Amino acid sequence: VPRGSHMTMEYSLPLNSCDREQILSYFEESWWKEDCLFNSIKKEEIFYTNPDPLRNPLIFYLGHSAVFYINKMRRAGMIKESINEGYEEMYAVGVDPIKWDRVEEVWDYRKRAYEKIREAIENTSLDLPITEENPWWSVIMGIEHQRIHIETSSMLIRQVEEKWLEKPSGWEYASTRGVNPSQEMVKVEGGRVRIGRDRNDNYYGWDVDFGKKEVEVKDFWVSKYLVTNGEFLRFVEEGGYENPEYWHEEGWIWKEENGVKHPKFWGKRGEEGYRYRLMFEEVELPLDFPVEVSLYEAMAYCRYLGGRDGCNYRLMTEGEWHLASRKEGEKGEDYNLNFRYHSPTPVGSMREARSDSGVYDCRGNVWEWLGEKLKPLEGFTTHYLYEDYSAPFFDDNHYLLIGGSWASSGHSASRFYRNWFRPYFYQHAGFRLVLA
Ligand SMILES: C[N+](C)(C)[C@@H](Cc1cnc[nH]1)C(=O)O
Ligand SMILES: [Fe+3]
Numbered sequence: 332v333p334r335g336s337h338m339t340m341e342y343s344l345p346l347n348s349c350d351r352e353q354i355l356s357y358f359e360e361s362w363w364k365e366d367c368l369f370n371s372i373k374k375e376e377i378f379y380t381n382p383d384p385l386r387n388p389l390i391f392y393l394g395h396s397a398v399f400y401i402n403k404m405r406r407a408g409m410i411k412e413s414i415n416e417g418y419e420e421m422y423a424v425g426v427d428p429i430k431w432d433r434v435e436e437v438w439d440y441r442k443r444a445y446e447k448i449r450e451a452i453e454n455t456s457l458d459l460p461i462t463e464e465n466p467w468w469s470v471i472m473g474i475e476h477q478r479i480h481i482e483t484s485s486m487l488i489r490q491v492e493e494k495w496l497e498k499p500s501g502w503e504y505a506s507t508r509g510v511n512p513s514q515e516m517v518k519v520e521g522g523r524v525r526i527g528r529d530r531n532d533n534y535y536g537w538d539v540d541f542g543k544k545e546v547e548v549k550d551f552w553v554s555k556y557l558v559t560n561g562e563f564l565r566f567v568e569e570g571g572y573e574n575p576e577y578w579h580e581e582g583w584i585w586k587e588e589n590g591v592k593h594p595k596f597w598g599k600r601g602e603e604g605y606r607y608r609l610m611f612e613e614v615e616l617p618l619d620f621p622v623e624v625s626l627y628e629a630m631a632y633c634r635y636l637g638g639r640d641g642c643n644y645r646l647m648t649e650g651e652w653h654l655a656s657r658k659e660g661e662k663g664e665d666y667n668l669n670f671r672y673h674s675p676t677p678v679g680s681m682r683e684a685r686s687d688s689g690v691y692d693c694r695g696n697v698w699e700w701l702g703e704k705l706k707p708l709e710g711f712t713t714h715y716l717y718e719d720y721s722a723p724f725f726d727d728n729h730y731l732l733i734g735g736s737w738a739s740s741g742h743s744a745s746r747f748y749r750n751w752f753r754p755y756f757y758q759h760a761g762f763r764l765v766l767a
């Protein structure tokens with residue numbers, strides 16, 4: 332199925348038809364969005380904190396997106412000179428488990444990098460289509476990487492104390508609409524599903540997005556909504572976090588070692604109702620928003636709900652999501668993707684985010700966990716610009732996450748972007764139920 336079609340809508344650049352100005356605007360929108368995100372931090376020294384203890388300090392990510400562009404475009408030949416070789420080494424490699432520069436210095440690197448990148452986009456000969464061997468792939472890779480980091484850095488900043496932050500002007504949250512709408516299982520017809528793209532696809536992809544796997548999917552029942560905060564509140568209030576029947580050993584230990592008694596972005600003080608941390612402020616828990624959980628917590632809720640309902644629940648496979656999410660004639664405006672809002676939306680409230688099987692928010696709103704591990708597909712090959720993008724993580728310890736959140740833009744909002752995280756890592760991410 333070609334990408335960019337009525338049922339494969341993409342938010343990224345059509346690489347067989349994008350003019351220079353389209354590339355420049357796509358680059359600028361990404362860079363300016365990242366600037367805006369980092370400018371939300373109103374105390375300079377917060378850049379030296381690592382608000383997510385599993386990731387580097389904010390200052391690293393401030394330099395990282397800029398250095399990545401320079402490194403890849405130099406390797407592709409689009410740029411000749413380095414700006415700062417020391418920076419281009421120190422800020423090049425991220426972490427998945429020094430002496431930092433001053434914030435002003437890193438902003439200064441960004442400004443110099445931005446100027447050099449823009450000039451290369453303005454002046455370099457452009458021959459369409461942009462394919463993997465075309466030097467321009469480094470520009471597209473650089474933009475798509477920055478777009479991923481806007482989202483991943485947003486999750487870091489969400490973990491910074493709100494007293495050091497101010498929401499950027501123009502960024503708006505979605506409002507709650509009230510109580511969670513009633514959950515319902517709906518039937519998705521099975522079929523033989525293709526996973527993976529063929530190369531020279533007219534759209535960007537990462538190495539792990541390309542390949543061929545065909546899976547026979549049986550008819551299945553899936554919850555039409557992502558599991559909501561209101562649904563999950565029943566799990567919390569009924570002792571789900573204290574009941575070992577709902578947890579396997581690995582998740583129980585995680586839960587105990589991290590003192591977890593509720594989802595990460597819920598908060599409670601005394602007997603007051605739960606609060607909920609948006610990007611930059613706390614509100615009363617929005618019962619109709621999708622709950623944002625680790626994979627462990629999603630599985631624990633599945634076990635709890637199966638006990639209550641007298642059945643078994645599990646998460647979708649990758650093939651199941653493609654079937655559940657299929658929507659002919661889909662449009663970019665249908666989904667809570669690409670900063671349509673700067674928060675999750677009430678489940679179902681994006682009324683055109685209903686798949687052809689009646690499943691809501693399969694694309695957008697919050698990532699959804701899958702029950703399957705990151706694996707390469709038949710035909711997997713690395714790209715010469717970035718050997719270690721996915722291969723280090725084929726350890727059967729990373730789970731797939733799919734469909735994008737409100738914060739996913741560009742190729743990260745694609746149906747065909749194959750995303751992954753450790754089961755204890757937090758993202759703007761939820762889940763739905765499958766009858767097992
Ligand atoms: C594919 N994810 C989103 C899991 C990756 C993408 C990525 C960014 N910089 C290097 N790789 C990650 O954030 O580690
Ligand atoms: Fe990175």
Ligand code: NA
Pocket residue numbers: 692693694695696697698699733734735
């Ligand atoms: Na989703």
